[PDB]
């Protein structure tokens, strides 16, 4: 599908992945990822990279995303819409640690704090070591790291531009 590049210009002032995460948050909160625009980073290694690449089939134009990422125009670079037969979609993978499933278990099974705690004691502690972006959610008022790993392409996308089901 045809695609557009979004490039973080060299930023001595800030972390490059911090600009990447702010770009992803602004693309998310100002629409963009309707269910078709999805990012892809030709430079995902240890980090997510600096080159973001949005690939709506319908087509992702610049006028829209230069006015969307206007708060980011100080150190962002928007490429021209080019074409690619395949894009490596990444998907959202979440990390589980303890208190999430402790409260999930006493909410569902009707167990006791101590019962759930005992059921999960010698378990849990997931620590993904995958490239990531640190994202500030708006519906829930905290910050978190969204982890990204390569999987097969899917027809539909989410609001962060990763793959769904």
């Amino acid at each position: 599908y045809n695609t557009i590049s979004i490039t973080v210009v060299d930023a001595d002032d800030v972390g490059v992945n911090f600009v990447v995460s702010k770009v992803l948050s602004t693309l998310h909160n100002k629409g963009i990822f309707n269910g078709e625009v999805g990012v892809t980073f030709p430079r995902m290694d240890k980090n997510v990279g600096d080159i973001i690449t949005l690939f709506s089939k319908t087509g992702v134009d610049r006028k829209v995303l230069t006015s969307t990422l206007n708060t980011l125009t100080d150190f962002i670079h928007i490429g021209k819409p080019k074409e690619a037969d395949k894009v490596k979609t990444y998907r959202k993978v979440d990390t589980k640690s303890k208190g999430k499933l402790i409260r999930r278990c006493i909410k569902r099974k009707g167990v006791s704090a101590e019962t759930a705690e005992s059921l999960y004691g010698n378990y849990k502690g997931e620590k993904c070591k995958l490239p990531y972006i640190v994202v500030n959610s708006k519906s829930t008022g905290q910050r978190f790291s969204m982890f990204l790993e390569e999987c097969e392409n899917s027809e539909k996308f989410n609001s962060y531009g990763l793959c769904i089901v």
């Binding site: 060299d10 001595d12 800030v14 100080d74």
Partner: protein
């Protein structure tokens, strides 16, 4: 000739900034300055590295710190002052016919260029370094000797041309060349938003369990003076493979990238300075590097 540097030759700082003060006004109503404070949030306990039976006991005296913009206002007011001082050839320690010879080698230095660039840094707004990203509109009012000079959109890296920057630079250059002093009152105005996470000075954490330690001034979000100074020092454009202006340092060693932008092809201060002292005609752009480090100050003896 072979004049050697005194074992203890030291210089002082000329450009002295103060600490910034974060306040919350409205873009239209700039009179309701509101103390932006620093709150605490839970998080303590469960140090939780893999194995490591030694540093697992870790006692917890923890609370992360955070700071946000009041939800009634939308404009961040950053406030600091900059005192420029003269006599850039004052060797506090030492001064035995070596700094005097360096003075007589650095008389033909263009203070005008340096002056313009220093003022340009302020007008551009490099001090923010974190709050800059995502702002709608920035307004830098520089009150130099009772003359409020409002600046706005000026490029950070590329040194653009502006008559008003040059005007303030004239006063600065006069102070730099001879002896005098000038203090300018800088107030930045940035349309951030209601409930916007402001970014104060992060502070040194030791071997504890904290990750969010914020520097505050009596319960008020503030930025460090040393960081403000580093933002005005970002003008080194005569280094090996000169790209973006970097912070003027004797060895050009930015520790964030772990590099050495002057230590490499004999472009470090010590080499250039010794050459000039003993009798080597330098280039204007490289002798200005020496003057810039004299303004910065430090121990240049040994």
């Amino acid at each position: 000739t072979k004049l050697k540097a005194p074992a203890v030759l030291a210089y002082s700082r000329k450009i002295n900034p103060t600490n910034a003060l974060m306040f919350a006004v409205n873009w239209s109503d700039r009179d309701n300055t509101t103390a932006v404070m620093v709150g605490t949030k839970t998080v303590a306990g469960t140090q939780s590295v893999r194995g490591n039976p030694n540093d697992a006991d870790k006692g917890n005296i923890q609370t992360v710190n955070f700071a946000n913009l009041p939800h009634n206002k939308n404009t961040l007011l950053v406030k600091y002052n900059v005192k420029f001082v003269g006599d850039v050839f004052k060797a506090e320690l030492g001064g035995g016919e070596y700094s005097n010879t360096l003075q007589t080698a650095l008389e033909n230095t263009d203070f005008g260029t340096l002056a313009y660039r220093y003022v340009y840094n302020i007008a551009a707004g490099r001090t923010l370094w974190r709050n800059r990203v995502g702002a709608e509109s920035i307004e830098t009012v520089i009150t130099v000797n009772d003359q409020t000079f409002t600046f706005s959109d000026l490029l950070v890296n590329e040194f653009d041309e502006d008559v008003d920057v040059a005007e303030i630079a004239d006063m600065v250059a006069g102070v730099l060349s001879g002896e005098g002093f000038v203090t300018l009152k800088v107030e930045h105005y940035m349309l951030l938003g209601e409930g916007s996470e402001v970014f104060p000075s992060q502070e040194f954490v030791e071997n504890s369990k904290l990750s969010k330690q914020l520097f505050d001034l009596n319960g008020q979000a503030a930025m460090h003076d040393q960081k403000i100074g580093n933002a005005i020092r970002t003008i080194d454009t005569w280094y090996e493979d000169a790209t973006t202006p970097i912070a003027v340092e004797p060895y050009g060693s930015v520790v964030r990238n772990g590099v050495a932008y002057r230590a490499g092809n004999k472009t470090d201060l010590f080499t250039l300075m010794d050459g000039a002292v003993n009798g080597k005609s330098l280039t204007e752009e490289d002798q200005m590097f020496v003057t810039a480090n004299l303004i910065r100050g430090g121990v240049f003896g040994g």
